[PDB]
Amino acid sequence: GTTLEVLRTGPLALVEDLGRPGLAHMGVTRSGAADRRSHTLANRLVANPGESATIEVTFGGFSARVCGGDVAIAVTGADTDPAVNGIPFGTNSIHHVHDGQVISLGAPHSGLRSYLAVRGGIDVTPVLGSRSYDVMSAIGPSPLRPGDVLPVGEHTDEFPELDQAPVAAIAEDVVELQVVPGPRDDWFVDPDILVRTNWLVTNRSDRVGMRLVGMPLEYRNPDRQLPSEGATRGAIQVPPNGFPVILGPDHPVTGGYPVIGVVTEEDIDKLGQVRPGQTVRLHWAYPRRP
Amino acid sequence: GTTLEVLRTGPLALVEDLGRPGLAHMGVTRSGAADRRSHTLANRLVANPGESATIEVTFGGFSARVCGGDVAIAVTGADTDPAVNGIPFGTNSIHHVHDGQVISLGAPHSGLRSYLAVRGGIDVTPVLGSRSYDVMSAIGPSPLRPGDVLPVGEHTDEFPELDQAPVAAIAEDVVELQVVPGPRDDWFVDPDILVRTNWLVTNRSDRVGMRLVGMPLEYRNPDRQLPSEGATRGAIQVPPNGFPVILGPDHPVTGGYPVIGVVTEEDIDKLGQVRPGQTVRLHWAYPRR
Amino acid sequence: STLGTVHNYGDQALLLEFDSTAEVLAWTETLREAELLGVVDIVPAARTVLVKLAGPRYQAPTRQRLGKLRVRPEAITHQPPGDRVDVTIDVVYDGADLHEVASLTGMTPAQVIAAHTGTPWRVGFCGFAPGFAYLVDGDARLQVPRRAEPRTSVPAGAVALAGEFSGVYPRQSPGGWQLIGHTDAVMFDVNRDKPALLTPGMWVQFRAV
Amino acid sequence: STLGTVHNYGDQALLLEFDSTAEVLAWTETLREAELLGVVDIVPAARTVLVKLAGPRYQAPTRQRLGKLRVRPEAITHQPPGDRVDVTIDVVYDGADLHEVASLTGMTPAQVIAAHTGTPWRVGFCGFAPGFAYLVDGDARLQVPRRAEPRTSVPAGAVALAGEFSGVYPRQSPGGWQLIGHTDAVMFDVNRDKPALLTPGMWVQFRAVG
Ligand SMILES: [Cl-]
Secondary structure, three states: OOEEEEEEOOOEEEEEOOOOOOOHHHOOOOOOOOOHHHHHHHHHHOOOOOOOOEEEEEOOOOEEEEEOOOEEEEEEEOOOOOEEOOEEOOOOOOEEEOOOOEEEOOOOOOOOEEEEEEOOOEOOOOEOOEOOOEOOOOEOOOOOOOOOEEEEOOOOOOOOOOOOOOOOOOOOOOEEEEEEEOOOHHHEOOHHHHHOOOEEEOOOOOOOEEEEEOOOOOEOOOOOOOOOEEOOOOEEEOOOOOOOEEEOOOOOOEEOOOEEEEEOHHHOHHHHHOOOOOEEEEEEOOOOOO | OOEEEEEEOOOEEEEEOOOOOOOHHHOOOOOOOOOHHHHHHHHHHOOOOOOOOEEEEEOOOOEEEEEOOOEEEEEEEOOOOOEEOOEEOOOOOOEEEOOOOEEEOOOOOOOOEEEEEEOOOEOOOOEOOEOOOEOOOOEOOOOOOOOOEEEEOOOOOOOOOOOOOOOOOOOOOEEEEEEEEOOOHHHEOOHHHHHOOOEEEOOOOOOOEEEEEOOOOOEOOOOOOOOOEEOOOOEEEOOOOOOOEEEOOOOOOEEOOOEEEEEOHHHHHHHHHOOOOOEEEEEEOOOOO | OOOOOEEEOOOOEEEEEOOOHHHHHHHHHHHHHHOOOOEEEEEEOOOEEEEEEOOHHHHHHHHHHHHOOOOOHHHOOOOOOOOOOOEEEEEEOOOOOHHHHHHHHOOOHHHHHHHHHHOOEEEEEEOOOOOOEEEEOOOHHHOEOOOOOOEEEEOOOEEEEEEOEEEEOOOOEEEOOEEEEEEOOOOEOOOOOOOEOOOOOOEEEEEEO | OOOOOEEEOOOOEEEEEOOOHHHHHHHHHHHHHHOOOOEEEEEEOOOEEEEEEOOHHHHHHHHHHHOOOOOOOOOOOOOOHHHOOOEEEEEEOOOOOHHHHHHHHOOOHHHHHHHHHHOOEEEEEEOOOOOOEEEEOOOHHHOEOOOOOOEEEEOOOEEEEEEOEEEEOOOOEEEOOEEEEEEOOOOEOOOOOOOEOOOOOOEEEEEEOO
16 A cells, blocks of 8 residues: 655664563563653554554654655654655644655754654564564664665544644753662662762663763672662663663663662653753652661 | 755754954954865865855754756765755765755764755855854854745856765764863863863854863862963863863854863864764873973 | 562562572562552562553552562472473583583583583573573582673574573673583574563473484 | 964964063064964964964974064054044943952042043954953053953943953953943944954043943
């Protein structure tokens, strides 16, 4: 049927969905969209089931041509001024694209990841029940390249274009995050450094984790090895160098670094919109105690 | 005549050229393209004189429609996979666009600034003899907006097109920069820390200065005031907080902060391609004494 | 017995602390069998169990339910019950570090192979890469430290040792473990009905070929 | 008189050091008159002159040419000839630091205004911002130190003092100078035939609004 031909990708264009939960027994991480709220919205706008895959675009710059029929699309997350044959259409809104037309996302100034949804979804072959690409293990559909032809799944042309809840703007400079203290905050000489430091986000940040730099967190016992433990996205690992890492959707199932704190659920999607060079400020969700 | 109608800009699209030099006597900085080599390259590819204005695009995402005739263009600097009506044509190559077609730059993964040149140049009105926009004093053609109509200057039709020397790829993470020590390296307790630190580039960086963060450089006399002195782009200022700032094209003519070192001419244009969150490593061009 | 320390791991997960891998594997079974509301995954590891929940609302109700759970002492096992193993892995003992392991353990290469093949191993936990299983409860004489510097490339099917663990590298990758041999068994295959050959709680027997 | 320290300022400029503004100004004219090959700009400042060059190739040859230069006058002027002042700037003396300047100079606010308006100033050099002129040769009694910490915002047209200088802030900006009043005169206008109101060498008279 209908396909999307990738003309240009930008820095990183991935097929993403809800991921592959419950697979730790085989060493497979959940993966999925880095900003779940934006991904879910893109799919709701085009009336897709919530399982449908979208294209997660990093720093904008993604272009695709429609072939074989008309499509309904939506772009959420970072505002890239999306256009169809040069005519802008607006982020967070359904847009009808005709056979032969070019969907083009620009470059955002605020935020990092945008989600392109298409009614019927990006119908690539699932891997371990998910169409999500896992950056670390390389499991799922390969990162998109120019020349790739993506199938659009089956759908009914008629659907209700429902009134959606307004979208909160993405933080342009300082990102404030709530952190549940622990479980290994006792490993650090002064764990409160975490919550009084202007942490800078580096260009080494990816879907495995966000790398922060600032005043290093020193260990009480620097040679102490933590037995490997299960991790989650939003967990703040502190490697021996003392520079915190906030785990992303592609984090490995287990890790060997002490976790000082874990970002609360409400603030986890904010991480998917933090650009390299931005400042992150952390705050305890509730006081820590021995 | 022929024009380019701006459809979309991306984070920041500015008209830039070689700047307005020689204006210190009126307190006006030179300004101009943050990456002079790429800017001059884009003009040479279209056989423009070096003085012709280009569009300096930040983080890509710039789109323009051609009206009133055909144009010869080139895109240099950060590789944004530029396209005409969605079809890519390649960075560092002359490309011919027809009346009604859309030139579109994508988003780079490496580098920050791209230069769109057009044969005849971006013929906006010069301000103090330059078509460069100065972000600090707001002197020059205003930052581009959707709806802006940019005139294409008059030009002859000289064919064939001259082949240019290949371009080295832009540093993807760690940028290594050569620095001439001084003149105020004596103001710092350990100036050598400058060349042993992984400096991180903040999102507060702009054409006025690149802001670096790391272990602060301490002053030997913290309350000492430096009388204002002439500055240049590539000069590394150390404000009282000890976080170095590498001055860009839009730095004011004079500054009050001690300069620990100045980036060499060979490496000054690399500064225009450093993205926020990247690592900058500095090295003495020759031994410090 | 009852649970020890139960940390809040953010607002939608719980990290249960244990003194041994055997306890981690017994409480994993107890938690799996409890079929707790809102549980997305149960992650056993060296000395802990991570219970991942569907949302913050499940945290307090799970903590309460967890307090009423009990593990039988019998379920905490260090040898296979009935000596019966789940899978047999055939290994060619031609590893690069076989002679080094011998020197470090105070054994001959013959004794190293015999110890590795003589005592079955339990898959404690998965980590590092899909299909990479950290094996425990094998011959304690084999305890050897990690390599000073990791190798750039270790082959796919490399049978190795580090600390109290044994493990099989699923694919070609960098690795710092002591290499004693190799297998032709497919550790991980995305198209296979059971993608990972080794699942936590399983008993493995190594066989020399 | 010969040059003092000549620093390499990167690989395409030279920073000349001087003990006084009078020497900076004398050397600026000497350099300006020498019309040296590859010189893009000559940037005088309080105690230095920055000579900007067209490329690294000009650095060592310019250093050599600089060594052959001799300060042309040695005899200078600090009074307007014919008593004709080039421009008169009208000032409302309502500055935030007027009372502080009075305390520091050992004068009353009335004497501060009278000293500022009583002796004409010469525009020595420009810097800081477009149209910002560093004024010299005014009443020496007005010599006051810079503020401990700079202000976040000083209004456009702010008439100020620091060290041996007086100056008018052309636009709203941060500033560490001592503020004595304000003017409605346009220091800088890009569309005016002479963009900057004050050019080096011009004589300025300040006049109190009232
Ligand atoms: Cl040169």
